[PDB]
Amino acid sequence: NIVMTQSPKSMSMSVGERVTLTCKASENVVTYVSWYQQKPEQSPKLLIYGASNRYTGVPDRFTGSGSATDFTLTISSVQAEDLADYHCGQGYSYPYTFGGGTKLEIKRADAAPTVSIFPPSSEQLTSGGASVVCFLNNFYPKDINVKWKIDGSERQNGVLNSWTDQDSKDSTYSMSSTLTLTKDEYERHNSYTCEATHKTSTSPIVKSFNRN
C-alpha cells in the first residue's frame, strides 16, 4: 500500500503568511496526488488534481507541488476562510489512500480564557446526578490544561474535557470541562474548583464555588 504521511496534523498560520503542508508517500506517485479541502460542516471538495492543477473555483493562492515521494500544498497568503482540514490522496494504485489530514488554523494574539463555573442544577440533583461545569472561553493558543479540585484535593476521575474548533468570528478557542459526580458524593464536600494552566498566566487560573 502507498502510505501517505501528512504533517503536521495541526498547523497555525498568521493571515498574510505562507502555509505549507507536506505529504510524503512510502513509494513513488506519478502526478497522482490530489488535495482536498474540508470545511467544518461539509464534505471534502477537490482542491488540487494531478499534483499542481487547481480545480474549478480554487483561488490561485492555492498551489500544489511535488513529484516522486514528496508533495506539498502551499497557501500563500492565508486568509481567514482557508480554515479547514486538508487531505492529500493518491489515485495511482489500489488501494487508494489518504494522508491523515492537517487542521489549518489561524494564528492570532494570545488571549487569556474567561472562566465561568456552574454548580449542578437543582433539576439534576433531584434526579440524583451532580455534574459541575467549567467554561473556559475565547482563549488562544489552544493548548490548555484543566484540573478539578474538591475541598482542595485534585480529582481526575469523572472529568470530561471538550474543545471547540477555532471560532470563525475571533479565531479563539473555547473548551468545556465537566466533573461528573453523584449527588451523594457531591453533598459530602463543600468546595469545588476548576484550575487551568495556560500560556497567558504564570499562575494557574482558578474558579471556585462553595456548595449551598
Binding site: 464534505s43 487531505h87 488501494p95 489512500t97 456552574f118 439534576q124 474543545w163 468545556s176 465537566t178
Partner: protein, 220 residues
C-alpha cells in the same frame, strides 16, 4: 449540475448489517466509476470501495473485504453499500464520490455524508440541564449561561438558544463519551442588564430518538 445525495445511516449493533444509498443526478451515472470513502470521528479519510461504470471491476479496502459489498442500480441512478458483520471500528461518516476528472482521475464530486454508528448502546434521548450562574451573578455587563446535555445516544444532538435568535456568542462543545453515553454542553453570553427580565432558553433536539427539549435558564 452534478448532484450526489446519501441516506441509510443510523445506529447498528456490532455484527449487524446495514445498506447505504447514494442517489446521483445531473450526469450520465452509468459512465462513471464510483467510490465509497469514510471518515471516523477521529479521524481522517479512509477509502472503502470502488465500482466501475458497468459493475465489473470492484475493489475493496483490506479492512472491509469480505464484509462489505458495493453495487449499483444504473437504471435507477443509485449507488449502494451493503455493510455486514459490522465492527465498532466501522463507525464513521460515509461519503460516496464520483470517479471523474478524466483524463486526470480524481474524486471530483462528493455526497453530503451519512453517519453510521456501530455499538450495542441503545438510542436514548438526553437529559437537559440549565446552567445557571452562581446563585445569581451580580455585575460584569456580560453574563454567561449554559446548557448541559447529558446521557444521550447516539450522536448527534443539535443546540440552539432562543430557537436560533441567539447565535452569536454561542459555543457548543463536541460530545464526549462516558459510561457508554454522550454528554455535551453549550454556553451563551447575554447582556447583564436584561437577564433575567428577558428569557433565555436552550433548545436541544436529538434526531435518533425524535426528541426535542426546551429549557429556560432561571436565576438561582
Amino acid at each position: 449540475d452534478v448532484q450526489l445525495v446519501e441516506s441509510g445511516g443510523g445506529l447498528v449493533q456490532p455484527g449487524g448489517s446495514r445498506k447505504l444509498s447514494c442517489a446521483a443526478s445531473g450526469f450520465t451515472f452509468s459512465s462513471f466509476g464510483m467510490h465509497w470513502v469514510r471518515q471516523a470521528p477521529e479521524k481522517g479519510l479512509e477509502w472503502v470501495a470502488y465500482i466501475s461504470s458497468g459493475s465489473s471491476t470492484l475493489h475493496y479496502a483490506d479492512t472491509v473485504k469480505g464484509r462489505f459489498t458495493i453495487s449499483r442500480d444504473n437504471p435507477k441512478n443509485t449507488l449502494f453499500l451493503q455493510m455486514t458483520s459490522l465492527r465498532s471500528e466501522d463507525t464513521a461518516m460515509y461519503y460516496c464520490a464520483r470517479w471523474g476528472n478524466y483524463p486526470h482521475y480524481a474524486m471530483d464530486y462528493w455526497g453530503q455524508g451519512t453517519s453510521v454508528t456501530v455499538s450495542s448502546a441503545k438510542t436514548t434521548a438526553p437529559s437537559v440541564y440549565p446552567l445557571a450562574p452562581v446563585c445569581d451573578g451580580t455585575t460584569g455587563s456580560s453574563v454567561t449561561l449554559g446548557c448541559l446535555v447529558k446521557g444521550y445516544f447516539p450522536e448527534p444532538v443539535t443546540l440552539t438558544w432562543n430557537s436560533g435568535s441567539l447565535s452569536s456568542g454561542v459555543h457548543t462543545f463536541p460530545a464526549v463519551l462516558q459510561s457508554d453515553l454522550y454528554t455535551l454542553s453549550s454556553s451563551v453570553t447575554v447582556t447583564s442588564s436584561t437577564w433575567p427580565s428577558q428569557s433565555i432558553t436552550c433548545n436541544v433536539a436529538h434526531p435518533a430518538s425524535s426528541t426535542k427539549v426546551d429549557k429556560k435558564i432561571e436565576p438561582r
